[PDB]
Each structure stands twice: as C-alpha cells, then as structure tokens.
Amino acid sequence: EKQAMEDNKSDIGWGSQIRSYVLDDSRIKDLRTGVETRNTQAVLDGSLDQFIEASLKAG
Amino acid sequence: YDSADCYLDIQAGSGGTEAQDWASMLERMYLRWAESRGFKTEIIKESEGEVAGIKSVTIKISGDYAYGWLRTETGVHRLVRKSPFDSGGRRHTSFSSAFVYPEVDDDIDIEINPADLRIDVY
RNA sequence: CCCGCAGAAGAAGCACCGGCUAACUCCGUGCCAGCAGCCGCGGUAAUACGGAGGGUGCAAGCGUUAAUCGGAAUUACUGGGC
RNA sequence: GGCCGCAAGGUUAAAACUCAAAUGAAUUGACGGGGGCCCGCACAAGCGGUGGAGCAUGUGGUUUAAUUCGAUGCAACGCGAAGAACCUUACCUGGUCUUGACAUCCACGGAAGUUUUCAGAGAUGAGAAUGUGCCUUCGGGAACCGUGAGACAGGUGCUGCAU
RNA sequence: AGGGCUACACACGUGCUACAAUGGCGCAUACAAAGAGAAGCGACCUCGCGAGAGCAAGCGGACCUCAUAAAGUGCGUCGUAGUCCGGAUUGGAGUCUGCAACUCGACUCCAUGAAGUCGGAAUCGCUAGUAAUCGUGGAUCAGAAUGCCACGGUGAAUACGU
RNA sequence: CUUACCACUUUGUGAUUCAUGACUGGGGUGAAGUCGUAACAAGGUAACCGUAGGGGAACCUGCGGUUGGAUCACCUCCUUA
RNA sequence: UAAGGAGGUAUUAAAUGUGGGAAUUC
RNA sequence: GCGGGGUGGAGCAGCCUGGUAGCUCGUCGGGCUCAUAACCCGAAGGUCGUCGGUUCAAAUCCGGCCCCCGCAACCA
RNA sequence: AGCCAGGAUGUUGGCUUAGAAGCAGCCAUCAUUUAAAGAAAGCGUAAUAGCUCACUGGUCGAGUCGGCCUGCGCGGAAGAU
RNA sequence: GCUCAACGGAUAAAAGGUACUCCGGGGAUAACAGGCUGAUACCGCCCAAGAGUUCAUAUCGACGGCGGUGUUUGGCACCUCGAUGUCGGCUCAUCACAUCCUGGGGCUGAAGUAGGUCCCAAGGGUAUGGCUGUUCGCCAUUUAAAGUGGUACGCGAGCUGG
Ligand SMILES: [K+]
Ligand SMILES: [K+]
Ligand SMILES: [K+]
Ligand SMILES: [K+]
Ligand SMILES: [K+]
Ligand SMILES: [K+]
Ligand SMILES: [K+]
Ligand SMILES: [K+]
Ligand SMILES: [K+]
Ligand SMILES: [K+]
Ligand SMILES: [K+]
Ligand SMILES: [K+]
Ligand SMILES: [K+]
Ligand SMILES: [K+]
Ligand SMILES: [K+]
Ligand SMILES: [K+]
Ligand SMILES: [K+]
Ligand SMILES: [K+]
Ligand SMILES: [K+]
Ligand SMILES: [K+]
Ligand SMILES: [K+]
Ligand SMILES: [K+]
Ligand SMILES: [K+]
Ligand SMILES: [K+]
Ligand SMILES: [K+]
Ligand SMILES: [K+]
Ligand SMILES: [K+]
Ligand SMILES: [Mg+2]
Ligand SMILES: [Mg+2]
Ligand SMILES: [Mg+2]
Ligand SMILES: [Mg+2]
Ligand SMILES: [Mg+2]
Ligand SMILES: [Mg+2]
Ligand SMILES: [Mg+2]
Ligand SMILES: [Mg+2]
Ligand SMILES: [Mg+2]
Ligand SMILES: [Mg+2]
Ligand SMILES: [Mg+2]
Ligand SMILES: [Mg+2]
Ligand SMILES: [Mg+2]
Ligand SMILES: [Mg+2]
Ligand SMILES: [Mg+2]
Ligand SMILES: [Mg+2]
Ligand SMILES: [Mg+2]
Ligand SMILES: [Mg+2]
Ligand SMILES: [Mg+2]
Ligand SMILES: [Mg+2]
Ligand SMILES: [Mg+2]
Ligand SMILES: [Mg+2]
Ligand SMILES: [Mg+2]
Ligand SMILES: [Mg+2]
Ligand SMILES: [Mg+2]
Ligand SMILES: [Mg+2]
Ligand SMILES: [Mg+2]
Ligand SMILES: [Mg+2]
Ligand SMILES: [Mg+2]
Ligand SMILES: [Mg+2]
Ligand SMILES: [Mg+2]
Ligand SMILES: [Mg+2]
Ligand SMILES: [Mg+2]
Ligand SMILES: [Mg+2]
Ligand SMILES: [Mg+2]
Ligand SMILES: [Mg+2]
Ligand SMILES: [Mg+2]
Ligand SMILES: [Mg+2]
Ligand SMILES: [Mg+2]
Ligand SMILES: [Mg+2]
Ligand SMILES: [Mg+2]
Ligand SMILES: [Mg+2]
Ligand SMILES: [Mg+2]
Ligand SMILES: [Mg+2]
Ligand SMILES: [Mg+2]
Ligand SMILES: [Mg+2]
Ligand SMILES: [Mg+2]
Ligand SMILES: [Mg+2]
C-alpha cells in the first residue's frame, strides 16, 4: 500500500503543480480552485487560510 | 481521518539547489501557518541541502483536525523568480512537493487463534 | 443541337498570413491550453496558441496523409572527393 | 555469422533506436596553476586598529496586533534617514467619511470672518452670539464658506526584468 | 486617538569608551582655525552645588553672541590595585524643550559601581603635516549625535626592494 | 489381372526463418539525484595511439610510438672578435 | 657591443559551480 | 547448557582493581571563499539497557528482567 | 393448582435513536382510576400491534409452598481377541 | 617446604581416537517393544462475558473449572543385553467406535435444493496417480465415501531392503 502511494505521488516536475507562486509578477494562483492573490509576502509568511478554505469549500 | 494529527513531508524537486531553497521556504511557511492555527509542530527529520536549503523534511503536526486542515495542501508547488544562485540572475522555475498523511495508530497484536492452526507430528 | 418562357432569380468554399513564403492588428491565454515541414512559438504587453477584423493564395474545390522523381553535384557516366 | 589464432584477440562487418547537428580552418574576445614588461598601502618595511568587554548604531533572525518600506559579495549593513515621544508614518488596533483630505467644472445657497456652548479620545456632530464687507451697467459678479449630483479626484499599491 | 517603527534565547557589520602611571585626580596657566545666528545668537548681573532660572546689553554681524579650545606646561597627590583604573547598571531628587518625555528625550546632582588587566582563527587603514591623538563648529533640528560634514593643535615610524 | 511411372499421405534426421522465454550484456536518452573530476590552459602528472596488468567510476601504471603539447625568461662566471 | 659554453631559479596546495538570456536587423 | 556484550548522534575505550566517562567521526558558533566543500579557531552533547540489591559511595561489584551476539546441543 | 372474570390513566415517562410505544438501550420510574392493573417478569412486533403475565375480584373446598440437616439411589460414564 | 582444592592426599612425573576393533560382565544401566504414570497429547463436559441486527446456549464461545482415553511427546527404569531384528512398502489381515459413505432421528439463524449441529447405528463399503526411502504432506484427476484408531505404532522362521 505504501508503494502504491509512492507510485500515485505526482512527479515533482514541470507539469505537476497545485499552486504557482510567481514572485516577479507578484502573483500566487491555485490551479485547482483558481484563487489568486497578490500579497506574496503574506502568503509566504503563512496566510494559507484563503487557499485551504477555498479547497475545503470546493470539496 | 480528518480529525487525526498529521505528518507533512516536503521534498525538493527539479530546481536543484533552487528547489532545495524553495523547499526550505515552504517549510517555514507551513510552520508559520501551523503556529497561526495553534497546532503543535515537531520536526521528525530534516535532510539539508549541501549548498543551501533542505533536501527533505518530515514534520509532525498535532491539533484538532490537523489532517483535515492540511490534507488539501498535498501536491507540487511551483516557484518562479530570479534565481538567487544563477550567476546571470535568470528567471528560473523550481518545484517542491508537500505530502500530508494522517497519523496512524500501531496495529494491535493478535495472538494466533489455536483453532485456526492444524498441527501435524511425524 | 435549336427555338420560346420566367426572374438575378437556383448556385462559394478551403487553406494560409514569424522566417523560409504572398499576406497584420486587437482581445483571450499565461511553459497552461495548445502549435509545429525545419528553425522553433507559448513561462501576464504572443503578427507563431485560440477567437475576431483585415489580408494573401487557390477555387467547385481546398487542405492533410501516403508514394515516386526533382531540387540532391547528397553514389558525382554526364557530374564529387581522400 | 564466417575465416585466422594456443589465447589475447585479429579480420570481414550490420541493424534497430536517437539527434539536428557532429566537424575543419581561421577571426574577435575571454580565460590559463602559459611567457614577457610595467603599475597600485598589492606585497615588503613600519605605526595604529578590528575580532575579546561594556555601551551606541545598522542588519539578520526571532517575536509581535504592528514590529512600515527599500539597500542586502567587493560596490547592503552609523545605507535612503542632514536627526520615529505626537507629527513624522508609509505599519497595527479601534473609531469615522464616501465626488471625497487634495483639483477643475455645474447648480444651488450663503461676505469673508470672528466668538462661543455642548458631546466625544479625537475625527466629528449639535447649538448659540457676532460681522455681512470689496469690484460693483442696483445685471452685479468673484476672494471665501457650505449643500446636491457626475465626469472625476486619490493610492509611499505592482512591475527598476517595460521606462 | 492610542500603539508599533525602540521588541530580544541569539548571529554579523560600523562606531564610542576603556582596560591605566607616556596615566587618573586637584589647583594654576599658555597657543587656534573654521562656522552659525532674528519665532535667532544671547552678554551682563542675580539666584541655584548643578543642569538651569529671572532680569536684561549688543548683533542680520571683521563690531555683538555662541565661545575659557583641548592635548600642553608648572606644582601636588595617587604607587600598580580591578585601584583615586573603568563607568556600565540601578535607586532617589531635579532642569529644559515640547499640547504631551509611561511605552520611548537630552542633561544635572546624590547614591551605586558591571564587564574589562590589551583580546583565538582571522582581518583593516595609512607613505607626511600623513598615521596617531586633542579639542572646535555645522546641517538635520521644538527637544533629541559615539553618526555625517568641516576646522584647526600636537605630530611620528617605515619603504632595502619586487 | 500384373508390372513401370506417379499425386495424396507417412516416417526419420538436418537446415533456415519468424515469434517467444526466467535471467543476463551492453547501448541511446534525460530542464534535479549520488561519487569523484578524466579531457579542454603546461587543465594543474602534456595529450593521444597499440598492447598488458590493475582499479567504485571517470581512469592509473609499464613498454614502444605520434605531435594533433605549453614554456623556454632571468642572474653569475669563463673564452673569442 | 655581439656570439658560444656551464651553474641557479620554480609555488607543497588549489575539488566543485544544476535547471528559463541578446531588442539592438533596410 | 556455557560464554560474551548493551556508554554523547555512529563506531570504539573506561568494568577487571568502586570515587575519576576518554578517542575518532558527527553536531553547533566564528573564520577563509563570489559560494560550497576542504581547511582553521572555538563550543556543546551520554546521570552508562532496565530494574533492583551491596556499599559512605556503583558505568564498575551482585541478582533478576529485556535485547544482541557467539558456541553447545551428542550415542539415539 | 387449575377455573372464571378482570388485568385501567396521565402515558408511547422522556432521549438517542433509523425506529424505541413495559419489553435495543439510556433513562427516570411517579401520581391518578381503585378490587387490582408493572412507567412492567416473559413471549412477540421493523416499530406499533399482539400474546401473556405480576396484581385483583368471583365459583370449588383441604391443604399448599420452598428452603435446612440427613440415609440410600439416578445421569454425567466412549476402545480396541 | 604441598590450590597433594579430585582437599583421608595413587606417582617426583601423564592428553586423545577407534565405524578396524577386541575380551570379561550387566536388563544392577540407556536405544525398540511391553509395564506403571498421564505432565503433555487427543476427546468430552461445567459456568456463561460476549459474537450471532434483536437473542448467551441455531452455530460459536472469553476468564475460569471437572473428567475420559492411552493416543502423541515424555517421566520412571519393572521384563528382556547366555540377542524380544527396525522405518516405509508389499501380501494377508483382525478388532474398536471417538461413523467417512450408505440407514434412522432431534434442533436449526431448516422455504425447496443444499447444508450446520447433536443423538442412534459398526451390516457392508471406504481411490488411482505426480514428487520423495519416506510416514506425513502438497498437487492432478476421481468417488456415495476416499474414516479415526488398536493389534510388539499387527504382519522380515511371509517378501522386500529404498
Ligand atoms: K492579460
Ligand atoms: K566521376
Ligand atoms: K595462452
Ligand atoms: K593572455
Ligand atoms: K567593533
Ligand atoms: K518619550
Ligand atoms: K534605470
Ligand atoms: K558608535
Ligand atoms: K571602584
Ligand atoms: K538641535
Ligand atoms: K534484454
Ligand atoms: K591524465
Ligand atoms: K594537452
Ligand atoms: K569498492
Ligand atoms: K583423588
Ligand atoms: K583411549
Ligand atoms: K572412520
Ligand atoms: K517391536
Ligand atoms: K492409566
Ligand atoms: K488422567
Ligand atoms: K537385549
Ligand atoms: K448418517
Ligand atoms: K440432520
Ligand atoms: K460399520
Ligand atoms: K516430509
Ligand atoms: K487397521
Ligand atoms: K517370530
Ligand atoms: Mg511575407
Ligand atoms: Mg512578453
Ligand atoms: Mg497577448
Ligand atoms: Mg494563429
Ligand atoms: Mg511526401
Ligand atoms: Mg542525382
Ligand atoms: Mg563532396
Ligand atoms: Mg567476428
Ligand atoms: Mg604588511
Ligand atoms: Mg566587540
Ligand atoms: Mg527592514
Ligand atoms: Mg517597493
Ligand atoms: Mg507615531
Ligand atoms: Mg536596472
Ligand atoms: Mg528602525
Ligand atoms: Mg546649530
Ligand atoms: Mg574614575
Ligand atoms: Mg573580572
Ligand atoms: Mg594593572
Ligand atoms: Mg599614496
Ligand atoms: Mg574628533
Ligand atoms: Mg583534470
Ligand atoms: Mg592531465
Ligand atoms: Mg596501479
Ligand atoms: Mg557533486
Ligand atoms: Mg555551468
Ligand atoms: Mg561513578
Ligand atoms: Mg552418529
Ligand atoms: Mg453415579
Ligand atoms: Mg575424598
Ligand atoms: Mg569410513
Ligand atoms: Mg579405514
Ligand atoms: Mg563382548
Ligand atoms: Mg532394570
Ligand atoms: Mg520405553
Ligand atoms: Mg510410553
Ligand atoms: Mg529403584
Ligand atoms: Mg518385555
Ligand atoms: Mg535364551
Ligand atoms: Mg456412537
Ligand atoms: Mg455387531
Ligand atoms: Mg442382519
Ligand atoms: Mg521416485
Ligand atoms: Mg502405542
Ligand atoms: Mg500401522
Ligand atoms: Mg511394527
Ligand atoms: Mg514374524
Ligand atoms: Mg540401503
């Protein structure tokens, strides 16, 4: 079962991403929910509640 | 299992040293978010990249519905910036993976029921 | 084949527009979606993706694929080299 | 695979797959633990320091409601700041406003003002006295205060990798 | 309006002050330059141990004020001690600016009296009126410099050579 | 009717070709991993070729060969014109 | 001044640097 | 059955013979470097498997219990 | 003992439950109608329902109940000529 | 003057192999079988927490308790060491019942079919092959079924001899 989880794990590569943090454009976007923010500093300091709540609401 | 405590594993990916730095940044972010939520964190283990950052880290998060709150963060996180390592300062992309799995109780040992065994002597 | 009748009345699409190669802008998108014969294009100000307007080339066809030769003097007899 | 060899191996000699290059000579640089010649508190020769202590100050990190923002090898770190109790201040908490603190236009009112009262942490809200002038075809108008719209204002918000 | 920018297990840079006798302290007494000043500089005199206060000249200044330069020199003392070194920290009492010094000002008086006895690896500046050391002024500025900018005093060592 | 020839068909043993096979050899590739740093400068022991031995690996060493290797300055002494 | 011969010079040490560059072009 | 072991994060000493924990790497801080390694200068970290006894006093001596090792386990 | 009546009310006591009505439990567990009728002892229903029963009246007319000590017996009690 | 500590001390002085073996003895004494025992083994029963939607007892049954057999592995050392030959197979069996099939029955969480479980019943019946010396076991394919045991783990003056 553990090996199945490892095989299931997305390759940590160029196509697989749940959230994109572009600092030059000063944008952070969650691919799954579409939630986008511009306060990269706040998100890097720990303001993940927006994305987490959006994902839980989306279910 | 949403109510259970959880473990968070961060692993560096394509960026190499930049990815290791990005993984360290992700670890800091997640620790800060846990502190905001009032959960208790303990670094189970932490492999550090030689030049910078961390190659990997396992963190234990304890609290009310910690796995519920954290489970949606499972995935690969893409980072785009001006590589603070590239001599030319080119705009690069780096990847780091966060994997959250719930804390699991150890399995209760069961004695082999003698009625389930057939013994032959010869 | 010819004569008469009726009314513009029944009859236009396909590919392409970064270079090669004739034909350019806006919006969407943001290394995603996608394109791609070659070089390549797309990572938030794309004439290269998709739509639109405009334009170019063909036309009851227009493109794609398959196949042969040409260009290939890239087997050189014509007509090459070490 | 064949032939040769005691063997090592030699000889002859492919294909699938993959790339849009691989390559030769020369040119301009850059580089060399290549050469030569010069120079610089670069060594050498000295003198005094820093790193140890206390304090000042900046930064990082951490903390925090906020500890505002930038600079962050040499070429950031007594740097922007030639001077944060309030103001500054860009940050936080709370209390407040929505053509508006700062402009122009339109309409409508009111001189400008000045003095007070009360309540509020203050913003502000409510009230009371007191002046009602200056140009002036008694058409006025406009210095200035408000009120009502909507074109607008406003942002020390993002990108120094558009400038 | 109030709070923060001043937080504080810690790490680094740049400074100031020291660890003493080529010095500390007390008394006396020489020699500068540069600059600022009107909501300013403020004399004098009086009061206060003092920071300062009251009254009040002069000066938009080669005129008046800031404003005795200090190191030095002379005399005396301390006699190598964590000291008559050091002056952090803390308690009490005040002054001034400013509506307002709690968070978070500067200064004064009294009491206190920490580390520190010359600093590991390493590392910096300087070739002459320089380094070193000693005072002075300015901007910013209501108040708030060990920072910055500038000005003088004293004043070296060494450079064989590449 | 019989004999000869001969198709189907049968047996044995080879050859060749295709597919396949536990396992195994190397090859190519890769927007990051591990170990070094082999070459390119005299690449820090010049490199390379043939061969042999050795070694986690690039490689190391011996023997012979090639140049498709860099540098070749400076001080002192002696002699001659 | 030129030519020739000989002797001395000399660093022990020094591994590594992923993955997103060029308008300037009738 | 008979022998051994169990000590900073790892590998080994210290037990015998009671009083006292060491070495190498690793970790942490400061250097060097453009940066990392190497290197240099400093630090920290084990109450000795677990209980018990004995002792003025136990890593040390004794006894259990747990783990790990070896051997032995025969004629039959 | 049988046998004949009866064997009520608030009230399905409420919660938790999927439903829970005496009868999954949890959980209270009372008063009223009185001859007596349990917030139920059992059966039963998915739940009710239903069936009892405890309780109590009426006819029949002598025993009846269930413990203690003790004597002797019964089952438990399957093997290979 | 002796750890002559094997401590009433063989000598001042001493270890092993024999499956190449040999002699005298012992059922005083082991290996097989018999015996005694029954820890263990196998088979029953008692209590009933619980499982079984409800419901302990259709089927199971925890924590505990009481027996039966001789039947595994043992304990002991009574028989046999002037000899009681052994595993498996083959041939031939014979008994038990704790019944595998067929026969009869009860309950069932038994609609039927097909089962579960227990009771009665021993008349008859109750595989062939692959592997292995095998017993055992696994596997293939059958059968109504491929029983469990005792018999010196029946049976070598019947065979075999892996
Ligand atoms: K856009
Ligand atoms: K030719
Ligand atoms: K040979
Ligand atoms: K050069
Ligand atoms: K310093
Ligand atoms: K203050
Ligand atoms: K610029
Ligand atoms: K300072
Ligand atoms: K003192
Ligand atoms: K001032
Ligand atoms: K293969
Ligand atoms: K080499
Ligand atoms: K070379
Ligand atoms: K090896
Ligand atoms: K003896
Ligand atoms: K012997
Ligand atoms: K032998
Ligand atoms: K026997
Ligand atoms: K017996
Ligand atoms: K018994
Ligand atoms: K015998
Ligand atoms: K039967
Ligand atoms: K039956
Ligand atoms: K029978
Ligand atoms: K076996
Ligand atoms: K038998
Ligand atoms: K016999
Ligand atoms: Mg064209
Ligand atoms: Mg662009
Ligand atoms: Mg666009
Ligand atoms: Mg297009
Ligand atoms: Mg074609
Ligand atoms: Mg041709
Ligand atoms: Mg050619
Ligand atoms: Mg061959
Ligand atoms: Mg020097
Ligand atoms: Mg210091
Ligand atoms: Mg900052
Ligand atoms: Mg900014
Ligand atoms: Mg403020
Ligand atoms: Mg720039
Ligand atoms: Mg600050
Ligand atoms: Mg001034
Ligand atoms: Mg003093
Ligand atoms: Mg001291
Ligand atoms: Mg002293
Ligand atoms: Mg100079
Ligand atoms: Mg000075
Ligand atoms: Mg090399
Ligand atoms: Mg080399
Ligand atoms: Mg070698
Ligand atoms: Mg590496
Ligand atoms: Mg590179
Ligand atoms: Mg001890
Ligand atoms: Mg033997
Ligand atoms: Mg009896
Ligand atoms: Mg004796
Ligand atoms: Mg033999
Ligand atoms: Mg022999
Ligand atoms: Mg004998
Ligand atoms: Mg006997
Ligand atoms: Mg026996
Ligand atoms: Mg026996
Ligand atoms: Mg006896
Ligand atoms: Mg006998
Ligand atoms: Mg006899
Ligand atoms: Mg029977
Ligand atoms: Mg019979
Ligand atoms: Mg009969
Ligand atoms: Mg066989
Ligand atoms: Mg027997
Ligand atoms: Mg038998
Ligand atoms: Mg027998
Ligand atoms: Mg016999
Ligand atoms: Mg044999």
Side-chain angles (χ1 to χ4, degrees), chain B residues 2-18:
Chain B
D2 282 340
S3 57
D5 297 335
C6 63
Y7 292 92
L8 166 65
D9 297 8
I10 304 175
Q11 181 82 38
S14 271
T17 304
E18 175 76 18

Side-chain angles (χ1 to χ4, degrees), chain B residues 68-104:
Chain B
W69 279 105
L70 256 188
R71 57 171 175 89
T72 61
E73 286 296 302
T74 300
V76 178
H77 299 255
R78 187 261 266 265
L79 165 73
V80 166
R81 56 188 205 185
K82 271 69 186 175
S83 170
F85 302 85
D86 172 54
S87 62
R90 275 168 300 123
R91 182 182 184 210
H92 272 293
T93 305
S94 25
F95 300 88
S96 188
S97 168
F99 179 70
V100 175
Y101 53 102
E103 166 70 287
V104 177

Side-chain angles (χ1 to χ4, degrees), chain B residues 111-118:
Chain B
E111 305 322 295
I112 312 170
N113 291 337
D116 288 321
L117 301 184
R118 189 218 306 165

